[PDB]
Amino acid sequence: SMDVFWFLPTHGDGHYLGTTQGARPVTLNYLKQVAQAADSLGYHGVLIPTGRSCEDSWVIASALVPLTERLRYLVAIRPGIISPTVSARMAATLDRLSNGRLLINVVTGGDPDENRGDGSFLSHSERYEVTDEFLKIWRRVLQGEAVDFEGKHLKVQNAKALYPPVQKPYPPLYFGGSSDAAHDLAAEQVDVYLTWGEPPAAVAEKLADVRERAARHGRKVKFGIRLHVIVRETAEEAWKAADKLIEHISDETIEAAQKSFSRFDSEGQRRMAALHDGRRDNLEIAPNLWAGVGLVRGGSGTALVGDPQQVAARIKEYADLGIESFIFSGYPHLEEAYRFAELVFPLLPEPYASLAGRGVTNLTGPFGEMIANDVLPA
Amino acid sequence: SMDVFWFLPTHGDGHYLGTTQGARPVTLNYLKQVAQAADSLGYHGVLIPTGRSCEDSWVIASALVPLTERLRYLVAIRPGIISPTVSARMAATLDRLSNGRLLINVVTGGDPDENRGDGSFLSHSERYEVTDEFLKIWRRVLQGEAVDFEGKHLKVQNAKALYPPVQKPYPPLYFGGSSDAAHDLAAEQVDVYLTWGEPPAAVAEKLADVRERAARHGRKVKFGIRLHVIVRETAEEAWKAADKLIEHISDETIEAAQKSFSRFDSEGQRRMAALHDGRRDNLEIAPNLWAGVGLVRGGSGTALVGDPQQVAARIKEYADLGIESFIFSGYPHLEEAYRFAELVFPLLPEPYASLAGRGVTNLTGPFGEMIANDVLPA
Amino acid sequence: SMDVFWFLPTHGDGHYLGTTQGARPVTLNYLKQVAQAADSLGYHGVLIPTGRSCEDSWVIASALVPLTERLRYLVAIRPGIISPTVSARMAATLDRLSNGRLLINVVTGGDPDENRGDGSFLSHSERYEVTDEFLKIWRRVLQGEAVDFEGKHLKVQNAKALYPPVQKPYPPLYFGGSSDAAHDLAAEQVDVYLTWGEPPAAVAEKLADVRERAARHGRKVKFGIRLHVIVRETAEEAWKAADKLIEHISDETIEAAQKSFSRFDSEGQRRMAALHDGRRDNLEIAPNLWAGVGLVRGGSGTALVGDPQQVAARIKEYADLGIESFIFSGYPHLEEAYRFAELVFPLLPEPYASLAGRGVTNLTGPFGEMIANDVLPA
Amino acid sequence: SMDVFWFLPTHGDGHYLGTTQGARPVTLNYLKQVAQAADSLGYHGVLIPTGRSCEDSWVIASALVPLTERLRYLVAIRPGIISPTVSARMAATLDRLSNGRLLINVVTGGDPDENRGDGSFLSHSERYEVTDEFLKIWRRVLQGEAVDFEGKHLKVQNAKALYPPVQKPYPPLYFGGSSDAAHDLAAEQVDVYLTWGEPPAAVAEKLADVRERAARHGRKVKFGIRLHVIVRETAEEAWKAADKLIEHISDETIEAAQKSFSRFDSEGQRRMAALHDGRRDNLEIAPNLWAGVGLVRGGSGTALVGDPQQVAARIKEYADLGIESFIFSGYPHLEEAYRFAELVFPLLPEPYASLAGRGVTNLTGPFGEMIANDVLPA
Ligand SMILES: Cc1cc2nc3c(=O)[nH]c(=O)nc-3n(C[C@H](O)[C@H](O)[C@H](O)COP(=O)(O)O)c2cc1C
Ligand SMILES: Cc1cc2nc3c(=O)[nH]c(=O)nc-3n(C[C@H](O)[C@H](O)[C@H](O)COP(=O)(O)O)c2cc1C
Ligand SMILES: Cc1cc2nc3c(=O)[nH]c(=O)nc-3n(C[C@H](O)[C@H](O)[C@H](O)COP(=O)(O)O)c2cc1C
Ligand SMILES: Cc1cc2nc3c(=O)[nH]c(=O)nc-3n(C[C@H](O)[C@H](O)[C@H](O)COP(=O)(O)O)c2cc1C
Ligand code: NA
């Protein structure tokens, strides 16, 4: 079993990184194009990023829910900048309108400059104390309880969400974080622990630690991984596409991004930037794992590059560690959603092996362009 | 010079108040029905309420924006439970996706229990201090400024909204409130001051008060009024429908509703609850002004009742006081939106006079159901 | 079993017949309103009329299919004015796009003036000869057969529809007609025989006649009835609403309508026109069967008028005769669709009994408008 | 000025011709993707093919109209298989539902086998006599006339289209045909004369003939061209992409299509098949004009292949001949719609030079994926 996600580029899209050449603006029509493509191609869901660099995740997810049928939306909540009772009501409303298609990504926010801009002057350990108290109120409120809670940071009295969610006990909690406090938080409250595309050896160590701490609370959590993907029919086309993706990036842009990454107080972000060292050489840190994206883009900075057989093999290596969720992305996000679904889906377990080419449809007849007006293609 | 709004019943709908008989569940489909009706009928916009008793306003409005073309959405924000910078990004995104169809209703929250349920333990004077600092940050960030602010309650450092809104300088701010702190805040920062359906005499005093305080800041504030409406072809049918609206309300529900109203420290709620005092008699506090709605429903608790000429007469009276915005509602909200547009619109100024019956359309030809198969109606 | 249909007023809508007072123009917005209401309220489908007085059924049905989830569309085909091979491809495409939600209403056309306007100069028997040959090509082509056909009226060689339909062997064939040629055609080729709202005794004879002729061919056809419905909470309101429907109808308009009906060459139209005799008196030709609609409207000219228990009883009577399909309509079509579902559905067999009031939804919680802000309705 | 159309692959889509490898089935979701992409990218419209090899044009176009805002639809009508009065009502309905976004492609049918399959046993000259009589009735009824027409093939009495279209006097008539009868028909009745992708010298002779024949009637006929496009950043990429397109085409499939084209009774099809005569070598019949598509595809069988400067240059060569409309297509039709708009639109006249990259968008701010979370791309 495997859940394959796509990605909504709410922070912008294009053919090349760190530039405006071939860039596509974030519009409702284009986001609808990507979401409906992922919905019809059979992706389990789409991840919506959050932060100052992105449009609001909740406005986007809510606008695309009535325009899609089965696609699930992994939406980020940010404790510390919103009341947990209100956030719970937001999740309840969106889960009700979507008929149980809401997934929650718990985000603590690793940029102190962004946090101060939102009015949150908490330290790294305080952000996780807030998130811990946030989730405890959030989870109980969505289970129908009038909550009285008085913590170090948050205090509510008679917190109630009158409209229950569709998913019981609440929309599943996804969480990504690499710090010690992050692993304690995931082990206690979250349902799925997420990691960025570190090499398999590093991901194995992070999974073993989360599984160990989850055993102390008598819990078993699931695991997912966030990776870019540059797959082509051959590996030579894939590496050429990987090279062209960062060819228009000047050293003034690389050094500016790494300088902004040094300001971040995020254990996961530092581990990602440490893979490429801010240089253009040795970007293939592992077989078919390419760290060129991290030179400019924050967060996910690695990509699987190669033919379909190679990309599938690297997906199996991660799956052998206990990873069941895979959140992929490509540039541009519309075309690469079709590319990954056509090249990689037939090599993945069901239902993705059967969803390839056809998609979510039951139609037959002339499959492909008709030869003249009386010859079926073969 | 008139904008006519309708209302999305995100707190529940039905044919009768208090009871569940004839109640209509609020789903995505039914909200699409109401929103698309007001859009096609030519209403300027719809009001979406906020609170523990309602679904989330932002999730609802975002879900209905891609499903309408011209309809504006008056969406409520509540300072004190969400970061002002994050709220500005939410407003920017929705205003961009809707192409400038977003309107903001500033809500301070008049129920101390609901405020404590969300984590806010502020007094009446402190809630307006937070809103005042909230709006100052909110209005400046949406204008492209990197804001440094340090007030009594809020503190931001390098607050920025990277995606500018469509409406300049920002989506217009609507505000309702009758306390002295409310009128000072309305005079300084809001664009439209809203009032509930009080008799014209009391509305004129509140309007004259806000208008004078706003003059000290050099601002010309617009005025709107929130009112229920029960309009029928004759005045006799209207009073029958008003009686049926409350015929299934027991005295134990009235006491439970008024017991909650006394908990509210809201000045506007106190003035509305004092018009009926829980009585079932003397509900016509003014010519064609019926206060039966306020027996169980908080907020707007008065209604215009009568034939189209009587309802339009009360509307012109309010308009002669300087009121340019009108937010109406009826039970059930779908049918009454058509009834009001078909009975009252032809009696209102343009464009509502021309929008009567036809609506926002350019189609010609047979008007009405055809006679036989070749005889046009006349 | 029981399938309950609604009706799309593609020939115009309104509150009153004959006149233009309270008329609603047929627009894409309003047809979306009616279709999406019937879809969400749980109706099995909607009937779309065809003819000179209506917008094209195939364009309307195709435009609303992507905007609805489970609603079926009973679309009309008229042999003699379109190639059966092309019509077969149209049915295949719409059935494929709707994922098997297409239903076919075979219409022979009962107005010689309209038929001549379309280029058809066939007599009554010749129209049924064309229809009989049409359906044979239509059914064989949709079953994947390369058809050579040389009949009296139609001639095709190597007729093929390369895209098969979702429903096998083809979308079901509904047919309405009262002539002897109609009963032969229905007994031999159609799946469901439809009749207008005649008294149960007259319906029983037509049903027995069709059933006997189908037995001779070794076939069993189902039966449905087409009726208007004016249902109110009490019987007195229903009869008052029936009087309002024809209060704005002048005798000059009745005479012009009945003069056009005498031009028609349809047995079913004459049987319907013979129920009211072109007069306003004795319109209740049967218990709760009111023939006032036929005084101006062509086709369905009777209505079920009464309280829910009275309407549900007349439905049960028809169902005792073997009728399993019920195609209802009301004025206006949007509001009356909710009225019938909220009043009659609880008195109908499953699933209409469980779909009553709530529609097709899995939402729980506060049912009805909230009392104050923490008191659930009861 | 210039109108740039795209193409809906209602006959099938994919990456490679002649084979099922990489093929995409014609589904509602995929067609919605292609149409909404062309709508948002700024294309003037899309062409929808008709015939036995495709899904029905009217069903497809009607289903996509409510899902698009500005995109126009060039929909085919085929005289001889449908009544002109019925066809005019379909055009009136779709033009009204789309608010004037309907265009008509007049198709006579060049395949005798496909025509006989639809019940039309007319010769080449007879098909143009039917079309001439069809269009006279079609154009007159849409102008609000009760038409009496008695011709050699068609006879109508009191033909009326009750619902007038939005476009006056009627939706524009596009027409393609290279025979002498076609050029007479285009000079007299049609608004836009279309030609397939012949070399510029052969196009100039056809346009000069039509212009001369139309001047005798005092009419000016707009000119358009239909062409596939394989454009890439470099010329070598485009030529390699063109080779990949036909690399899976078996020589037995080429002969299976050329023998099918010999049966056709179309002068324009013969002129297209005479450009290569099945020869696999030297398919570049003109600078950047590649006839590789004509090996297996009927109708349009030539493509523009080259870098953006070469493709734009060939477009300007056709424009100087007087061609104002361009109907382009590519494989696959979704990805190639973006490729052409992003690569060729900036080299085209307004408004396509402004629609490049930006598209129909008034949004400002970040343009492309954000560098980190505060640095905008440049
Ligand atoms: C898969 C994944 C997705 C994430 N998405 C976001 C996001 O959208 N916005 C964000 O600010 N942080 C995101 N993060 C990062 C964390 O949620 C959080 O901001 C912080 O970096 C965790 O800090 P830590 O590694 O020091 O424990 C994501 C992390 C992962 C692994
Ligand atoms: C037109 C209008 C709409 C309002 N909408 C809301 C709402 O949706 N939620 C809410 O809590 N309060 C709403 N209020 C009430 C005030 O915004 C605020 O909550 C408080 O009651 C004002 O307190 P005050 O009158 O003492 O200054 C509304 C008021 C008006 C006039
Ligand atoms: C339920 C029902 C629906 C019908 N719908 C249509 C229609 O939409 N357009 C139409 O022209 N005739 C319609 N008819 C009438 C017949 O299909 C046909 O046109 C003709 O009147 C039958 O003639 P006959 O009774 O003499 O056999 C309908 C009949 C029934 C019973
Ligand atoms: C741009 C263009 C589009 C056409 N589209 C179609 C079509 O969709 N279906 C079709 O059968 N023929 C199509 N044709 C061909 C003609 O409409 C017609 O079928 C026939 O080939 C003309 O015959 P002629 O060249 O001998 O005058 C098209 C022609 C052109 C130039
Ligand atoms: Na390193």
Numbering used by the authors:
A (entry chain A), B (entry chain B), C (entry chain C), D (entry chain D): 0 to 377
Show sentences the authors wrote.
The 2.4-Å resolution crystal structure of MsuD in complex with FMN and MS− (ternary-MsuD) was obtained by cocrystallization with greater than 5-fold molar excess of both ligands. Ternary-MsuD crystallized in the space group P61 with four MsuD chains per asymmetric unit, arranged as a dimer-of-dimers. Of interest, residues in all chains within IS-4 (between α7a and β7a) and from L354 to the C terminus lack any electron density, preventing their modeling and resulting in a very open structure. In each chain of ternary-MsuD, α7b and α7c from IS-4, as well as the protein C terminus of an adjacent chain, are ordered and observed to enclose the C-face of the (β/α)8 barrel, covering FMN and MS− and blocking solvent access to the active site. When both the lid and C terminus are ordered and bound in ternary-MsuD, the active site appears completely enclosed from bulk solvent. To our surprise, the dataset of ternary-MsuD contained contiguous electron density for residues A355-A377 of the C terminus. The C terminus includes two short helices, a 310 helix from F344-L347 and an α-helix from Y351-A355, followed by a long meandering loop that extends from each protein molecule, inserting itself within the active site of the adjacent molecule at the tetramer interface. The binding mode of MS− positions its oxygen atoms within an extensive hydrogen-bonding network with the guanidiniums of R296 and R225, the indole NH of W195, and the backbone NH of S299, resulting in placement of the methyl group 3.4 and 3.9 Å from the N5 and C4a atoms of FMN (respective average distances for the tetramer), whereas the sulfur is approximately 4.4 Å away from the N5. Therefore, the observed binding mode supports the methyl of MS− as the site of oxygenation, and the closer distance to the N5 of FMN is consistent with use of an N5-peroxyflavin intermediate. The third residue, E368, extends directly into the active site and is positioned to interact with Y330 and R296. We also cannot rule out that ordering of the lid and C terminus within an entire tetramer may be perturbed by the crystal lattice, which would explain why cocrystallization of ternary-MsuD yielded a tetramer with four ordered lids and four ordered C termini.
